[PDB]
Structures are given as structure tokens and as C-alpha cells.
Amino acid sequence: MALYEFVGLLDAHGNVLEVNQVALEGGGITLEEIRGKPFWKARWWQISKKTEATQKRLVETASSGEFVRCDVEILGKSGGREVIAVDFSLLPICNEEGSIVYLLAEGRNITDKK
Amino acid sequence: GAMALYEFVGLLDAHGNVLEVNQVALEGGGITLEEIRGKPFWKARWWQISKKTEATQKRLVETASSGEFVRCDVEILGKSGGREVIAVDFSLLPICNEEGSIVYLLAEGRNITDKKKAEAMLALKNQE
Ligand SMILES: Cc1ccc(C)c(C)c1
Ligand SMILES: Cc1ccc(C)c(C)c1
Numbered sequence: 001m002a003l004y005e006f007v008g009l010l011d012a013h014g015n016v017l018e019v020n021q022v023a024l025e026g027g028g029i030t031l032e033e034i035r036g037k038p039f040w041k042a043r044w045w046q047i048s049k050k051t052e053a054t055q056k057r058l059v060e061t062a063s064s065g066e067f068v069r070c071d072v073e074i075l076g077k078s079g080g081r082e083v084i085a086v087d088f089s090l091l092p093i094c095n096e097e098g099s100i101v102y103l104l105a106e107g108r109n110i111t112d113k114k
Numbered sequence: 115g116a117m118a119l120y121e122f123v124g125l126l127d128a129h130g131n132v133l134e135v136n137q138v139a140l141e142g143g144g145i146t147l148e149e150i151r152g153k154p155f156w157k158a159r160w161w162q163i164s165k166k167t168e169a170t171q172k173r174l175v176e177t178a179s180s181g182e183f184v185r186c187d188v189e190i191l192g193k194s195g196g197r198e199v200i201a202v203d204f205s206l207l208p209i210c211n212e213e214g215s216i217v218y219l220l221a222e223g224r225n226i227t228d229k230k231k232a233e234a235m236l237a238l239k240n241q242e
Contacts, residue, residue: 020134067212093209096183
């Protein structure tokens with residue numbers, strides 16, 4: 001399976017901790033703008049109030065241990081100018097005790113097709 | 115619940131090749147992501163104190179790759195652009211995908227040099 005295009009590390013509550021350069025560039029965001037704040041508040045997810053609410057719901061789902069995978073549109077190309085379709089996933093990351101300590105957000109472009 | 119925040123963090127693929135590293139870890143070791151991306155974590159400057167520390171990180175990454183959680187105190191080249199040694203509480207967390215395969219490893223590091231040094235002053239004050 002091809003490596004992600006977009007990756008982000010969130011805490012268990014969905015706060016942004018780390019994001020790769022490709023995601024930062026494509027949404028036109030700096031890590032300092034979004035670090036420590038909820039992921040769904042970042043520009044990728046801001047097409048509308050509903051895309052933000054959708055993302056908030058997927059994060060909360062991951063926080064409680066459910067793996068998420070779905071197709072979503074984000075402001076994710078040319079510095080936040082262009083919408084792309086992304087195959088999106090959230091992986092809860094657990095410690096040995098089984099506690100969710102981080103979430104891993106991954107994204108892979110699917111716009112070229114179709 | 116809560117946990118002390120990492121200071122160093124990195125994402126490796128299942129075989130320990132470097133995918134992502136935060137700015138604090140890169141500047142502590144004096145390296146750029148581009149120097150180490152796509153190559154084994156154990157080759158990165160942090161682990162280059164000797165052939166041994168290198169060899170050791172390699173085995174830990176292989177352990178984590180098979181699904182075992184790793185955690186140990188170790189000294190790395192992690193301050194003044196990779197020139198000075200610091201003690202770190204080090205962990206490697208295997209990350210499984212929905213399908214159950216290990217897809218990544220998350221390397222974390224908290225600097226514990228201050229805590230070791232205090233421990234040692236106080237053990238001294240204990241005899242005196
Ligand atoms: C960090 C990150 C991961 C995954 C996605 C879709 C985005 C937009 C950002
Ligand atoms: C990313 C990273 C680099 C170096 C170290 C020691 C740790 C713990 C994490």
C-alpha cells in the first residue's frame with residue numbers, strides 16, 4: 001500500500017501535535033497556527049460548518065477507539081485554494097495498557113480518479 | 115488519562131525508515147529531515163555515540179517492528195546540534211492499522227538529564 005500523502009499526529013482529544021509538510025502546504029497552513037488546537041478547526045476541514053462538524057464527529061469516534069476510514073473533500077491543494085477528494089483515515093494509537101494516547105490522521109489523494 | 119508531553123517525536127515505517135520528525139528533535143541533533151528521510155532511524159545522528167548505540171537502536175527498532183513495545187533510558191547526541199550528550203526516556207510504540215498489521219512506529223523521547231543530575235546531587239547530600 002502506497003505511503004500517505006498527508007499525515008498528522010493528534011492527541012487523544014484531537015488537538016494537533018505534528019503535520020507533514022505536504023499537508024501544511026496543500027491546506028496553506030503553518031504548524032504554529034494549528035498546534036494545540038482541535039484538528040477540525042484547521043483549514044483542511046473548513047469548506048463548511050458541516051464539514052467541520054463531520055470531522056469533529058470522526059475525531060471523537062477515533063478518541064473512543066473506533067478506527068475511521070472514509071472519503072472526504074478538503075481544502076487541501078495549492079495553499080488552501082483547491083478542493084481535493086481524499087481517502088481519509090484515523091488510527092487510535094494505544095499504549096500497552098490499551099489506553100488511546102494519540103491519533104494518526106492519514107490522507108491519500110483520490111481526485112485524479114475520477 | 116494524561117502523560118508528560120514528548121519533547122522528541124518521530125514516525126517510522128514498519129522497518130524503521132524515517133518518515134517524519136519534529137523540529138525539536140532535528141535541531142537537538144543538528145540534522146535536517148531531508149538528511150535522514152527514507153533511511154533507517156538507527157543511522158540518524160542521535161544514535162551515533164558509537165557502533166554499539168547504533169547497533170542497540172537497530173535491535174529496538176526490529177523488536178518494535180514485530181509488535182513489541184520498547185522503552186528504556188539511553189543517552190543520545192541530542193543537544194547543541196548533535197554535539198552534546200543528553201539522557202532520554204525513549205519509547206517506540208508500534209502502530210497497527212485497522213487490518214492488524216504494524217504500519218508505523220512512533221519514536222518518542224523526553225529529556226531526563228536534569229532529573230538524573232538532581233538524583234545524583236541528592237544521593238551526595240545523603241552521605242553528607
Ligand atoms: C495532517 C493531515 C492528515 C490527514 C488529512 C486529510 C489532512 C487534511 C491533514
Ligand atoms: C524523533 C525522535 C528522534 C530521536 C529520539 C531519541 C526520539 C526519542 C525521537
